[PDB]
């Protein structure tokens, strides 16, 4: 009634544009095949405030649920939780970016806790979590990883310089 899953997958794509990227979330649907729409329906600073609209069922209903990211820059942290949720009583998307020596580590700390009318014991999704994490976060992780390296971001070299100002 309560999985935490962390998975945890390394990418050597800058913090800048890892920041920057997964901020957009405009761009979620070119990265995310899971989803067809992504929906700004405000922007508390911190808070983007989105809904997150699938394509249609089988009977042809639309679904989609508002979902709060919160980006939290100083332990690199992001928070998404979701407002709409149903078999998933609880759930908190925690986004950590570990910047290591290989490269930026994008950990996905999914809390979450199943109860009402779930056939699984979250250790089940968890199981299938781990699986499509690795899935679909290296699908991000060669997605993103492809941009940093189209777009060459930050070098060491703007400032191999440094502006000898402390003021």
């Given at each position: 009634?309560?999985?935490?899953?962390?998975?945890?997958?390394?990418?050597?794509?800058?913090?800048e544009?890892?920041?920057?990227?997964?901020?957009?979330?405009?761009?979620?649907?070119?990265?995310?095949?899971?989803?067809?729409?992504?929906?700004?329906?405000?922007?508390?600073?911190?808070?983007?405030?989105?809904?997150?609209?699938?394509?249609?069922?089988?009977?042809?209903?639309?679904?989609?649920?508002?979902?709060?990211?919160?980006?939290?820059?100083?332990?690199?942290?992001?928070?998404?939780?979701?407002?709409?949720?149903?078999?998933?009583?609880?759930?908190?998307?925690?986004?950590?970016?570990?910047?290591?020596?290989?490269?930026?580590?994008?950990?996905?700390?999914?809390?979450?806790?199943?109860?009402?009318?779930?056939?699984?014991?979250?250790?089940?999704?968890?199981?299938?979590?781990?699986?499509?994490?690795?899935?679909?976060?290296?699908?991000?992780?060669?997605?993103?990883?492809?941009?940093?390296?189209?777009?060459?971001?930050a070098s060491v070299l703007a400032d191999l310089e440094h502006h000898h100002h402390?003021?």
């Amino acid at each position: 009634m309560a999985g935490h899953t962390d998975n945890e997958i390394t990418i050597a794509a800058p913090m800048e544009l890892v920041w920057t990227m997964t901020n957009d979330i405009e761009k979620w649907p070119g990265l995310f095949s899971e989803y067809a729409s992504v929906e700004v329906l405000g922007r508390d600073d911190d808070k983007v405030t989105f809904r997150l609209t699938m394509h249609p069922d089988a009977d042809g209903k639309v679904w989609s649920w508002v979902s709060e990211r919160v980006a939290d820059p100083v332990t690199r942290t992001v928070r998404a939780q979701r407002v709409e949720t149903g078999p998933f009583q609880y759930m908190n998307i925690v986004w950590e970016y570990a910047e290591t020596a290989e490269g930026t580590v994008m950990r996905w700390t999914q809390d979450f806790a199943m109860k009402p009318d779930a056939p699984v014991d979250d250790a089940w999704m968890t199981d299938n979590i781990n699986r499509n994490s690795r899935t679909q976060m290296a699908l991000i992780r060669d997605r993103i990883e492809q941009a940093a390296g189209e777009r060459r971001t930050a070098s060491v070299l703007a400032d191999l310089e440094h502006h000898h100002h402390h003021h």
